[PDB]
Write a protein that binds this DNA or RNA. Structure first.
Ligand code: CA
Lengths: 311, 21, 355, 313, 25, 21
RNA sequence: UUUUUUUUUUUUUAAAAUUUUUUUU
């Protein structure tokens, strides 16, 4: 009773790791338009510092695999630095202009799916610690503050402009919230993120070096998502419609913890007419209200996360 | 793996729930 | 007689105009129309929460306990639903036109402005709910990401009721109600990028404003309710986005027509006490309720003011409030359809003291 | 199960076949908004001349108050600045004077495009026309960039904070070398096409008053591609960007040719009105919900040629 | 419950399954 | 002949997606 | 000599959802 794309849509959304070739085709709603479904997916290895609580945050920031922060066991993380997808450059441009309208190959985006799997690679005798997963509803926000309009006459003329911020980061702490998955590190963990807008709402780009609690660059005590290398080559592109995944790994002293980290995500984007990528664009899938209703129903029926021995 | 199976399983359980007969 | 052939597009005079190249495309074309056998049948049943959603929306004051539970759409996610009502006693200054503006700014019960009878109001100052701090933080940081307890919000309902408390001889005047579609907006203006070399370097940044305020004046628009002060007035606000759109927070001291702080001539919604403890949080998806009370000289006009609102919010997972979060109402398309249909079938307002 | 409602049918006619009736049938989007709206149904019909030996770009983007944006460039060259041509009704809708477009003088607080189309009608004779009309759609969307600005001028070089500035994505696709999807006909054949919803579901848009919508936050940047309000925004400024895609018309004219035509720009806009404007007397409740019409609309939009000869309207 | 009673009343004047088309999506 | 005629053509091949009882 | 739309055939080659055997560490 589900359309072809509708079923593929569900597969991509919840069971990304189960398939050899990704079935995803995009969101089967009434969009029915020119889209290019970017399927970002890579695999790396992470090594956890002994005697630290490490945080791997998978947020819907186009072009970024995840954000990391390491802190003393029990301490409060503040800055999560992004690890970009090797594909960033091709999608959003490079150089000092990276991410801006001049080099960006898209004008709008929305996440059809996003998931992550942590596959421990330590031996059963040397590792030690835990894995904890949970989701936070990260959303961009604004604050209106004064800025100088004219430097004359001192101390200057002002007006109120808007600065960008991000809400939700404070929920990333050592104390896991009610809805979470807590397990032995060696068992790994897998989970998917899901739509937190009501209809897979389209998002506009907002190019920035950081998405923080403060509008003051580098603020040491402001919690924030930060583009690496001062945004010289890769900057934050925006924040999607799905919630954010939080992976907390506690590694005691002397523990030897390593894992393979695999992330997936399907993003529908409105393509610039002139890029090499446009060639691979096409029509959004046909309307399948059932698949949509099913997705929104299903998203609530699974454990917050599951061990990696059953992704 | 077996996550899709789980989805399929839950899919059946919520079958009578949907706003569509 | 061919399949994947390019499509030609008729030349005017086929003899006077050279032939143009037939049109081609990128990616496959849309699939052939779906057959009518793919019959998806629907059962028109109103869900329990959908019914509660309707009560909370329109008949806010008619039950033993607020029935609201949230919007029964496909959001089906983790939310924190605020079901509250600010009930307070007020007095209207003799010989003035008082404006009680109920706008969807999380944390605020309403905005007030007093003016000479017949005059034009300009600045409406907010009166916050005592729960403001609990929800959006305290101190100078109030309202910001660091102290806010939510990351997104949307209004499921909002209503206001004015209950006169004067006797039949001591009062005098009128009550008038109407709704305005208040929406935030932006303006791009230059700001200093570098102070060197004078007069400095500039770039265009965006500043926030608010459209719709000009509609708050002594002259009531076509769609309104006008009555004797002593009869009070009640009404609900309703969704002006198309689908109960989710809203992001925009923390500001004022939402005005100008980006210049305190501009005397600029109409605006202003946070009280210079935003020391309570700042404007953002603007919701429902329209804004405007109550205009005209109190002549010598008149003793007192009343209880009730402000209701039901807000669905995406919570921070660390607040002490998180223990009350749960999954939002299950999808009820019938209820949603009913709501959007019903919202247009009632008088702009009704007397409160007749019910 | 059912069939189209009257308004739903009108909605469809207005959307795709704008020039086909006695009186514009449009009434707005027949979804669940069911509220108070002022619906603009207008068409800017004007005579134009394409400068010999130039590539002329007529960009029809969803910026309330503007009929289109024009750019003239050497044949083959890259256009960068498209200057807006406003509807005579601009002042009436968005205000006049230095304040034009701002909350104080604007008569609306929100908008969404129900339809938008463009038609080029050649008026040259069979011995004087020469050149082509290439048409294609682009997805123009506003965007943001967070950059630092001076918070305090003391102590030098000053104190900074990061603020947002507005930009626009998509313009780069407007160039001399069009995509394979483009419709390329002879100038004398004219061209007609409609734009369509590229938002989730006919999303409502807020106003963003600006002099330009460019790739750069620096005013007048020579290399930045941009949509520019005419006359320095003295009387008419950019009001915002709608939910439908943008229509691109590239007209190539050689030296010696005389390419003239009448240009028609249509648009149907649903707007939430200020209750005090002199226009309010025309506001009423938007069309009743017609799910069938909506499904049809979204289905059909992707099913017609990018453009067709103008003598096929 | 005078206002709700009114809502119920109107709720019936539009109950047809103009009228409500159960097909909300 | 007008675009509408063409729209009508396709508009009729379109069936719909929902039905109530 | 042209433009759309509408089907049937097969060889196809795919993608998808279901039933059975026969090999292989
Ligand atoms: Ca929406």
């Amino acid at each position: 009773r589900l359309t072809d794309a509708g079923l593929a849509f569900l597969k991509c959304a919840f069971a990304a790791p189960d398939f050899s070739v990704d079935p995803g085709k995009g969101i089967p709603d009434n969009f029915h338009g020119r889209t290019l479904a970017i399927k970002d997916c890579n695999t790396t290895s992470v090594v956890f510092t002994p005697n630290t609580d490490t945080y791997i945050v998978v947020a819907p920031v186009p072009g970024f695999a995840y954000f990391r922060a390491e802190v003393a066991v029990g301490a409060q993380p503040t800055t999560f630095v992004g690890v970009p997808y090797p594909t960033y450059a091709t999608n959003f441009g490079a150089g000092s202009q990276n991410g801006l309208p001049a080099v960006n190959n898209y004008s709008k985006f929305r996440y059809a799916s996003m998931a992550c799997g942590l596959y421990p690679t330590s031996n059963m005798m040397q590792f030690s610690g835990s894995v904890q997963v949970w989701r936070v509803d990260l959303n961009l926000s604004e604050a209106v503050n004064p800025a100088v309009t004219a430097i004359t006459p001192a101390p200057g003329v002002f007006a109120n402009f808007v600065d960008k911020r991000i809400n939700g980061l404070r929920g990333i702490r050592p104390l896991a919230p009610r809805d979470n998955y807590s397990g032995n590190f060696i068992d790994g963990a897998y989970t998917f993120a899901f739509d937190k807008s009501t209809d897979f709402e389209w998002c506009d780009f907002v190019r920035s070096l950081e998405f923080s609690e403060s509008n003051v660059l580098g603020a040491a005590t402001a919690m924030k998502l930060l583009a690496p290398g001062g945004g010289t080559d890769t900057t934050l592109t925006g924040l999607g419609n799905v919630n954010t995944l939080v992976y907390k790994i506690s590694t005691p002293t002397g523990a030897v913890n390593t894992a393979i980290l695999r992330t997936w995500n399907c993003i529908e984007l409105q393509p610039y007419t002139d890029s090499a990528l446009f060639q691979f664009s096409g029509v959004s899938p046909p309307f399948d209200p059932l698949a949509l209703e099913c997705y929104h129903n299903l998203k609530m029926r699974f454990p917050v996360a599951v061990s990696s021995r059953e992704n | 793996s077996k996550f899709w199976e789980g989805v399929l399983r839950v899919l059946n359980q919520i079958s009578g729930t949907l706003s569509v007969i």
